[PDB]
Structures are given as C-alpha cells and as structure tokens.
Enzyme design. Structure first.
Site: not given
Ligand SMILES: N[C@H](C[C@H](Cc1ccc2ccccc2c1)C(=O)O)C(=O)O
Ligand SMILES: N[C@H](C[C@H](Cc1ccc2ccccc2c1)C(=O)O)C(=O)O
Lengths: 258, 258
Positions: B10-11, B68-70, B147, B178, B180
C-alpha cells in the site's frame, strides 16, 4: 476484446446446467460445448477426457471448463497443468462453497456412483478443512429421472426421498455433486428441510469463471453472444430435446466422432 | 498446505481496509503488509511500487495484492506479468462489480486525485463495457478526514456532502475508488440516497482472492492465522494507532527503510 469462446467438456447432457448458469450470469460469453454421450475405467476416463480437451482446443477456446464431476476428479488437475489456457472444474468451487456455508461442520455430498467412488469431494474438503465431517452418498436413480424430465413425478419424489434418507437430519449442508441434480433442487430441499443449505457446484463454478476471466484479462464484449455451438458424440436428436427445454429454446447440435 | 503469507503493498495506511476485509473473510490466511507512508511522478511511481514488490518478494509471499488504487493503475499490470506468483489490484474487481450492478448505466467513481488523474476506472469500465457512462470525481479531503478518525464530525459530513454534490442524482452506482473511503461509507450513502448502489473495490478484491487462492491451489490451513506482520517506511507509531483501531486490536508495526 477476447472473442474466443469458453469450452465445456461434459460426459453427456448433464453439464448443460453449467451452461444455463453461464448464459444466465454472462450472457455475452460465447460457448463451445462437447458432451460425450457415447462411451463409458479410470485411466480410461483420462484418455477420454483428453480427447474432449483436444477437440475443445481445435475450437480455439480461451478457457476450458470440466462440466463433469467425474472427469474433473480424474483429469482436471492434470489437463489444467498441461495447458496454457485456464481450466477449472466444478468440484473445487463446490467444496469451497460448502466449507464456507457449513454451520456445524457436518457436510453431505451426493452425486454419481463414479464421482462418489472417486471420493474427490471428501478428499478436497478434508484437505482444505480437515476438521469437517463429510458424508458422501451415490444417487444412481437421479440422473435417469432428470433426463426423463419427469421431476414433478410423485414416483420421482419417492426416489429422491428414499435416496437421501441416509443423510436426512445428519448434515447442515448438502453438495449437489452431479451437474444433473440442480434440476431436482426443489424436491431435494423438501426432503432435507430448510435447515440444510444446498451447494450447487455448477453454479459455484460459473461465479468463479467471471473472476477468472477478469484475472486473465480475457473477457468478451459485454454488450454483444449468439454464436453458441454444441457438439455431441451421439444421440444428436435426444440431445436437442433436453437441451432445448433446459435452455428454453431450440438449439442446434452437431453429431461428432472424435 | 501453502503456509506462505499473502503480501499487501500500500501507499500508506489506506490499504489496511483491504486487510480488515481479508481477516474478516479469510481469518486463516497470513499477512505481510508494507505501506510506503513516506515518499510521494508516474514513471517514478512504478519504481516505488517495484521497490515494494521486491520487499514483499523477500518475505516469501504466495500472492501480492496492490491495496493502492494509484499504484494499481500505474504498475499492477506490469508487475503482474513479470512475476510467477498471482498479483491482483483493487481497481478491476471494483469496475467489474460496478458494471454488473449498474441499473441505468450511469456510474460514478470517486477517489484520490492521482487515481482520478490516471482515469484508470473509466478506461477499464468503458473497455469491458463501452456503453456505460462513467463519471469520475476527486475527493482530496476524504483521506485526511479518515486518518483523523473523525468521521462522525458534522464538519466531515459537510465535506462529504459538498464533495459529492456534483454526482448526486446523476448516477445509479458509485465506486469507492480509494481504499480509505470504506470508512466514510454511511455518510457517503446518505449523501447519495438509497437509490445509489456503492461498490467497495477493496472488499470486491478480497472476494476475488479466495477464488484465486483456490484456482492456484495455494490455500492455507482453514482451522489455524496469527503470524501477521506489518511494515511501514515511516511514522511507525501513528501507524500503530490507526491500524489498531481499524483492526480493533493493538498491532506491531516495523519501521522499514527499503
Ligand atoms: N493512497 C494515498 C496516497 C497515493 C499516492 C501514492 C501512490 C502510489 C505509491 C506507490 C508507492 C509508494 C508511494 C505511493 C504513493 C494517492 O494519492 O493516490 C494515501 O494513502 O494518502
Ligand atoms: N455424468 C454421467 C456419466 C459419468 C460417466 C463418465 C465420466 C467421465 C467421462 C469422460 C469422458 C467421456 C465420458 C465420460 C463418462 C458418471 O457417471 O459420473 C451422465 O451424464 O450420465
């Protein structure tokens, strides 16, 4: 994008219920179905299965589904590891579904004499979950009753009744371990009582297919199927009948000789 | 038999909801979870993801789940084809679930600015199902609210309200894009109305895991997990907090420096 059809290898017309489930859940997917009505020990069944797998292959399928519980128990795992395309059986998903629905841990699985002799369901259930009590029971009179399409027959209900007697009140969940049995579902429910949850392996297999189609990124067009093709190694006409009733529509069967 | 743990990259702490879903659905499976709290463009995200994949690998995982979606949108498919072990993301299962629940065909997906910028959900939905109308919308104020663990905060409900305004009454199904967001579920439901079906990608991903664990015959012992291990690249303590609340139990986090 993948427009290739999903192949179904059955031992006769039983697997067709798995097909009705697919058409029901994934109307867009195309079908290639081969039911080896002719022919009928173990090592010999693997050979037969392979013959049907090779045919499905020459039909350019993106996936192969063992719609037959016996075939699954004997060759599924082998054929699965020898091919690059996905191959799943109806046994495992039915066992996993049972493992998860059992309240007390007393599971009953019914099915064909051969499926039961293979004891595949017991071996898988107590392999993933050793503590569960599994009670298997052959119902050789069930298949013939289904192909007759005389389910409402009070004569049939008696057979269902007497056949399940041995399990009545001794299990919390019963696995329809034959793809033929979903057609005797209502009757089976009554004979067991509302306290027994029934697991339809075929249906549990179709629900697994979508997940697999995604994972291997080989979905077909969601808005488009109609190019379904059925092959039987014998009795093409009786096949059309049974198949046209279950699928609620006349369907064209092709007599094949592997 | 496979006692190897399932890895989660995860991020930050968001993916933890996917974890709570696993623990909920497959209590017997073991967990290795790495959340890269530190660090924060695209090509750079692939590099970061790979670093986390290699770590999960050095932890002997039988599977890797992009919580993690991103990250999913950027590297999932790549990493998936470069490894022999299974790798699935949370995006596809959420899109597939949405495709299947949409009544009218008007789908709304919310999520992180980066996830939305990647436009991954739209591309997948209209790839498998071109006719569906997909409406994406970034909710950058959602993550911070979660959070803080101040969801009941009327101040929060306003943000949820104003943030979704643009989608209210324009979609039949909304995708929590997301990991979250499942913690803001109730609030989100109210703001949309009971006529909008909500798709929890993370949860839809866990339901896919069991099917995959079966298919690749790598299940763990159903009656035995407790050896869960959490790794974070920063803020180990704040991590323990959030994690101990969501998982309803103090958990031990280990500060890592890849
Ligand atoms: N999921 C968000 C952060 C992510 C940013 C992010 C996306 C992908 C990542 C992959 C590896 C390390 C760090 C990463 C950070 C977003 O904004 O989409 C959060 O936990 O705040
Ligand atoms: N499913 C039953 C027949 C099977 C027998 C059978 C099992 C496996 C086969 C594999 C390939 C060709 C023919 C086969 C036949 C059973 O009793 O378990 C039926 O349709 O009547």
């Amino acid at each position: 994008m993948d427009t290739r059809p999903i192949g179904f290898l059955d031992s006769g017309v039983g697997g067709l219920t798995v097909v009705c489930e697919l058409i029901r859940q994934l109307p867009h997917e195309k079908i290639v179905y081969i039911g080896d009505s002719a022919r009928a020990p173990k090592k010999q069944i693997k050979e037969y299965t392979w013959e049907l797998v090779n045919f499905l292959l020459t039909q350019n399928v993106k996936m192969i589904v063992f719609a037959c519980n016996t075939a699954t128990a004997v060759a599924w795992e082998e054929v699965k590891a020898a091919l690059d395309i996905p191959v799943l059986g109806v046994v495992l998903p039915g066992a996993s579904a049972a493992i998860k629905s059992t309240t007390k841990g007393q599971v009953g699985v019914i099915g064909t004499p051969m499926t039961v002799a293979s004891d595949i369901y017991r071996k898988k259930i107590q392999l993933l979950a050793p503590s569960i009590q599994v009670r298997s029971l052959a119902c050789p009179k069930f298949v013939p009753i289904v192909e007759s399409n005389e389910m409402c027959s009070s004569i049939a209900k008696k057979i269902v009744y007497d056949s399940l007697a041995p399990l009545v009140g001794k299990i919390d969940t019963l696995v329809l371990g034959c793809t033929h049995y979903p057609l005797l579902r209502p009757i089976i429910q009554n004979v067991m009582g509302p306290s027994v949850k029934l697991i339809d392996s075929g249906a549990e297999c179709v629900r697994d297919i979508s997940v697999l189609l995604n994972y291997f990124d080989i979905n077909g067009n969601y808005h488009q199927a109609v190019e379904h093709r059925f092959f039987t190694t014998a009795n093409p006409e009786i096949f059309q009948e049974i198949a046209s009733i279950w699928l609620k529509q006349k369907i064209n069967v092709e007599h094949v000789t592997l």
